[PDB]
Amino acid sequence: ERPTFYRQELNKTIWEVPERYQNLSPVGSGAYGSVCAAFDTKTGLRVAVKKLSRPFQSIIHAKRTYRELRLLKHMKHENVIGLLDVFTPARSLEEFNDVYLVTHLMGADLNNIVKCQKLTDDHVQFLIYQILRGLKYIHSADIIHRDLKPSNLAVNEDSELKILDFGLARHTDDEMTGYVATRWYRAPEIMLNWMHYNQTVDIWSVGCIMAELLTGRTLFPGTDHIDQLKLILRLVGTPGAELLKKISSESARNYIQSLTQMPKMNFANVFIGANPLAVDLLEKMLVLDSDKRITAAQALAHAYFAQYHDPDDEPVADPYDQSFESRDLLIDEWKSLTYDEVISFVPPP
Numbered sequence: 001e002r003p004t005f006y007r008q009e010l011n012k013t014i015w016e017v018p019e020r021y022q023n024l025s026p027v028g029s030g031a032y033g034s035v036c037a038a039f040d041t042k043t044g045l046r047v048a049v050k051k052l053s054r055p056f057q058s059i060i061h062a063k064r065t066y067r068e069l070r071l072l073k074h075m076k077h078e079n080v081i082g083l084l085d086v087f088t089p090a091r092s093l094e095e096f097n098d099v100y101l102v103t104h105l106m107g108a109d110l111n112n113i114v115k116c117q118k119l120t121d122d123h124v125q126f127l128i129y130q131i132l133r134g135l136k137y138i139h140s141a142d143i144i145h146r147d148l149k150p151s152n153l154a155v156n157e158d159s160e161l162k163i164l165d166f167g168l169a170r171h172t173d174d175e176m177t178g179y180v181a182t183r184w185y186r187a188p189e190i191m192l193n194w195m196h197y198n199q200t201v202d203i204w205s206v207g208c209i210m211a212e213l214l215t216g217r218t219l220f221p222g223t224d225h226i227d228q229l230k231l232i233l234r235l236v237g238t239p240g241a242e243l244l245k246k247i248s249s250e251s252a253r254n255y256i257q258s259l260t261q262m263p264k265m266n267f268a269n270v271f272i273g274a275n276p277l278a279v280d281l282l283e284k285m286l287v288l289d290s291d292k293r294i295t296a297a298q299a300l301a302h303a304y305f306a307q308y309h310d311p312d313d314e315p316v317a318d319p320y321d322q323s324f325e326s327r328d329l330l331i332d333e334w335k336s337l338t339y340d341e342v343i344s345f346v347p348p349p
């Protein structure tokens with residue numbers, strides 16, 4: 001049941017894809033690979049296809065390819081980017097060297113659409129509800145996104161939202177330096193490596209996104225790591241004794257204690273004119289001590305989402321086995337595991 005493949009060149013890249021996929025049009029290329037939009041004649045869906053760039057060129061890249069395929073194959077939720085299809089034109093492991101990943105075409109991200117704009121409260125409710133719905137699912141599988149920001153939120157013309165580009169990290173030091181959106185949505189404990197982080201980092205990011213949707217302004221647009229920390233602590237207060245103890249980094253703990261203590265600000269005086277329920281939720285997400293932040297499951301039940309919340313339609317995921325992360329395998333071993341995952345793929349019903 002191997003489909004028939006056909007070939008075409010799009011901006012200097014050869015795409016070899018099953019006949020079902022028609023009207024391929026490039027959207028972009030980079031180190032990540034190449035993306036096109038297409039129409040899936042079999043399902044009637046508008047799709048986006050990612051062709052991975054050299055996916056087995058080093059041990060690190062082979063493992064990265066396996067990691068992404070595993071994550072995308074696991075995710076089956078309305079608010080999370082998952083796989084409609086995955087294919088290779090290769091007929092054997094020996095000739096296997098290209099991976100194509102098919103998902104829904106959303107066509108924009110939240111950053112490209114609403115940057116610098118203040119959204120209506122009902123609009124923010126719908127957008128944040130969807131993010132939290134997807135996060136409840138992701139977190140239930142013990143997956144951490146780690147890099148949630150407006151540009152990682154795929155959105156269509158009806159403001160329907162799917163979370164993408166996650167569980168994958170892994171930014172360079174340069175990319176996180178200076179006046180950059182790559183760092184503005186990061187929880188302080190991960191930005192400054194205070195301690196072993198967990199899924200609560202994502203809730204901080206949601207707080208930062210929500211604030212920005214409500215105001216049209218970046219919440220913590222730091223010019224560098226330290227400037228950003230100062231912006232954060234001005235809003236949420238300096239750490240107390242309880243949190244200082246949890247900062248397992250001696251150097252980081254020492255630095256924090258050099259700062260003049262500041263109390264948490266009144267969020268009602270920061271977010272002037274906002275829905276008091278939005279203000280309440282922001283206070284519960286933007287807690288310095290990650291242990292004390294609201295979870296996605298808890299936030300869904302918050303009164304702010306009364307119009308959207310349905311406890312019978314906020315599903316959880318199967319557990320996700322990431323034991324492979326602890327393994328040092330050879331290129332050909334990662335490649336074989338990836339091939340097994342490609343060939344074992346079963347499409348959605």
Ligand SMILES: CC(C)N1CCC(c2cc(-c3ccc(F)cc3Cl)c3c(c2)N(c2c(Cl)cccc2Cl)C(=O)NC3)CC1
Binds near residue numbers: 072083101102103105
């Ligand atoms: C961080 C940079 C390097 N990265 C930004 C995201 C890009 C990107 C990747 C993927 C993707 C993800 C997983 C998968 F299995 C297959 C695919 Cl194609 C999609 C999109 C964008 N978009 C999209 C958006 Cl969000 C805005 C405009 C146009 C388009 Cl096509 C979709 O609509 N659907 C899927 C890839 C490059």
